[PDB]
Amino acid sequence: RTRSTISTPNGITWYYEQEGTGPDIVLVPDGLGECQMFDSSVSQIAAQGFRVTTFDMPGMSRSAKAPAETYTEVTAQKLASYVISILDALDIKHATVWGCSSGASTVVALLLGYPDRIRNAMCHELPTKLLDHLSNTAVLEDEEISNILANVMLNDVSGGSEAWQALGVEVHARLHKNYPVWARGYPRTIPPSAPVQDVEALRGKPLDWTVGAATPTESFFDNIVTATKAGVNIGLLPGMHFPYVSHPDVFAKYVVETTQKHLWNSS
Amino acid sequence: RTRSTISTPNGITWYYEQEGTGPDIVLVPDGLGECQMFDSSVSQIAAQGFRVTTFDMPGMSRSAKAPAETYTEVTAQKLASYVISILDALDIKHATVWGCSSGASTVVALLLGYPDRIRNAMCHELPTKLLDHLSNTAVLEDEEISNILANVMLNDVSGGSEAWQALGVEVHARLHKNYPVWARGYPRTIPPSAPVQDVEALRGKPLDWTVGAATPTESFFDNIVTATKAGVNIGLLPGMHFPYVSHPDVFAKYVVETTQKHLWNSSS
Numbered sequence: 164r165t166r167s168t169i170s171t172p173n174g175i176t177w178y179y180e181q182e183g184t185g186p187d188i189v190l191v192p193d194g195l196g197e198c199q200m201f202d203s204s205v206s207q208i209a210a211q212g213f214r215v216t217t218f219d220m221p222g223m224s225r226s227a228k229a230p231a232e233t234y235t236e237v238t239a240q241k242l243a244s245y246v247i248s249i250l251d252a253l254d255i256k257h258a259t260v261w262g263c264s265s266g267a268s269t270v271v272a273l274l275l276g277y278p279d280r281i282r283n284a285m286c287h288e289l290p291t292k293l294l295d296h297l298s299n300t301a302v303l304e305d306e307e308i309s310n311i312l313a314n315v316m317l318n319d320v321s322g323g324s325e326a327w328q329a330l331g332v333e334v335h336a337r338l339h340k341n342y343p344v345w346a347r348g349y350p351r352t353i354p355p356s357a358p359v360q361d362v363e364a365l366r367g368k369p370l371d372w373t374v375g376a377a378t379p380t381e382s383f384f385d386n387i388v389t390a391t392k393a394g395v396n397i398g399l400l401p402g403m404h405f406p407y408v409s410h411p412d413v414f415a416k417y418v419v420e421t422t423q424k425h426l427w428n429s430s
Numbered sequence: 431r432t433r434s435t436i437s438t439p440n441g442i443t444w445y446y447e448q449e450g451t452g453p454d455i456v457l458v459p460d461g462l463g464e465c466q467m468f469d470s471s472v473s474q475i476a477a478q479g480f481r482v483t484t485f486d487m488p489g490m491s492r493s494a495k496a497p498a499e500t501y502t503e504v505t506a507q508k509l510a511s512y513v514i515s516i517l518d519a520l521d522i523k524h525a526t527v528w529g530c531s532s533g534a535s536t537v538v539a540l541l542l543g544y545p546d547r548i549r550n551a552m553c554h555e556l557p558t559k560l561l562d563h564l565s566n567t568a569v570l571e572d573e574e575i576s577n578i579l580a581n582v583m584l585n586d587v588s589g590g591s592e593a594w595q596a597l598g599v600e601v602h603a604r605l606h607k608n609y610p611v612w613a614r615g616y617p618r619t620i621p622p623s624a625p626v627q628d629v630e631a632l633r634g635k636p637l638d639w640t641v642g643a644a645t646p647t648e649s650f651f652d653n654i655v656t657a658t659k660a661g662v663n664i665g666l667l668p669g670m671h672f673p674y675v676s677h678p679d680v681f682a683k684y685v686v687e688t689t690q691k692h693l694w695n696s697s698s
């Protein structure tokens with residue numbers, strides 16, 4: 164595993180990790196922007212003959228050396244531009260991409276906006292609705308935001324509290340600092356930027372969409388409807404909002420099999 | 431509120447309830463076949479200018495006096511034929527219908543099989559998949575089945591433990607007896623009979639489909655996909671499998687508004 168940094172001319176110094184050789188698979192974090200959540204799966208995926216790349220997102224965790232623009236008023240289109248910048252820097256010309264949440268919005272924006280660069284995209288639980296209870300955290304003090312959201316992650320949406328806690332004290336210390344950054348920059352601007360307003364733009368595209376099997380139906384009901392309308396492959400992964408944490412082996416298998424399917428089709 | 435019994439020539443003695451005057455709305459129970467679950471909503475719906483009818487299902491609760499065929503090897507099509515028989519007996523010629531679970535399969539079968547009789551159908555959480563863990567209860571002892579399924583209903587699918595328990599001792603005592611009947615009669619044969627395999631048959635039909643907002647996505651994922659493919663209205667109610675228990679006021683409003691929508695469209 165390569166663990167290093169790279170600077171892009173939009174002012175971001177990225178923390179990234181890379182393992183393996185072969186076709187590129189890129190794992191984009193959820194809004195919390197913490198790529199240690201992929202640690203187990205990166206090795207499993209790479210071992211199947213892929214070069215796997217992941218990174219902390221701008222302003223989050225180890226990628227905190229970034230201009231304010233990159234972690235405030237954040238949109239799917241901004242995030243897509245940033246991911247393209249690090250792919251450019253790492254000379255990754257053509258990639259399979261995974262993303263959950265704001266990461267899901269990001270990878271659909273990547274597929275639509277940069278089609279030459281993207282072999283196929285896997286999106287999981289893509290937020291398309293403003294949620295006032297999340298947006299309202301943006302005006303609270305840092306410590307209260309961190310306490311509220313850490314509890315939401317642990318008890319409401321992790322999909323496996325034991326696995327969530329087992330990320331470890333170091334990860335949760337980074338997450339502690341990320342929660343206010345995410346709260347201020349993401350929930351008010353990410354959902355209206357969802358690149359799924361044009362259903363016909365999705366039709367025929369190499370997109371595989373998932374929702375957590377244990378997620379309450381109302382949370383991403385709209386994903387299932389939109390995917391079905393567009394004829395896009397839609398299915399379930401075990402757990403909820405973080406399958407790469409709750410069920411890393413199932414997650415890795417899904418990423419490998421889906422990438423293999425598209426390598427067969429493209430040939 | 432009328433609370434009475436009526437016998438149909440297929441050998442079923444039904445317990446039924448009826449309240450109100452106006453266009454007919456019929457509330458078909460879920461698999462447990464217990465119509466006291468509709469009690470609050472029946473009055474709320476009737477008060478908006480409807481005649482509301484409901485009943486215990488054959489072999490269940492107060493409708494237990496029925497031939498074995500009516501509660502064994504049960505299918506949506508069998509249940510639809512039984513519901514038509516009591517509607518005939520009550521001189522209900524044209525009705526809006528609601529049903530959840532096996533009741534959902536039943537009302538879709540009613541809409542497709544007896545279109546002249548059905549104004550519109552509301553289906554909630556329609557089972558299309560065999561679940562071995564439910565099917566396997568059928569070989570256990572009666573008391574074992576009742577204990578297991580009472581717990582499943584409360585903790586897994588009620589959508590509201592306080593409201594579920596508040597149904598009270600009389601209701602739960604009836605459910606206790608129904609669980610083995612349901613277990614032996616329903617889970618092995620109801621899901622294959624689901625009348626939603628032919629998507630094009632659903633298209634354009636006066637059908638409104640719901641799933642519980644709190645229900646785990648995997649449970650009725652297939653409903654959302656199927657409804658969307660058929661262009662059928664699909665949405666959510668609060669709670670899980672029993673919105674008429676967990677959220678009776680929201681349930682009643684949904685039934686009233688949906689029926690009103692179709693009464694408007696029908697005149698158009």
Ligand SMILES: C[C@H](O)CCCC(=O)CCC/C=C/c1cc(O)cc(O)c1
Nearest residue numbers: 193194195264265290293294349350353
């Ligand atoms: C891990 C995730 O990316 C960030 C933590 C928030 C969370 O998990 C809540 C459940 C999923 C909601 C995502 C979401 C919801 C919104 O309304 C706006 C938005 O920008 C993202």
Ligand SMILES: C[C@H](O)CCCC(=O)CCC/C=C/c1cc(O)cc(O)c1
Nearest residue numbers: 460461462531532557560561616617620
């Ligand atoms: C209230 C319900 O009608 C009867 C109790 C079972 C239950 O609630 C479990 C959750 C919903 C499943 C319905 C279902 C599932 C099957 O595999 C087969 C079947 O015939 C019905």
Ligand SMILES: [K+]
Nearest residue numbers: 410411412413
């Ligand atoms: K696993």
Ligand SMILES: [K+]
Nearest residue numbers: 677678679680
């Ligand atoms: K209510």
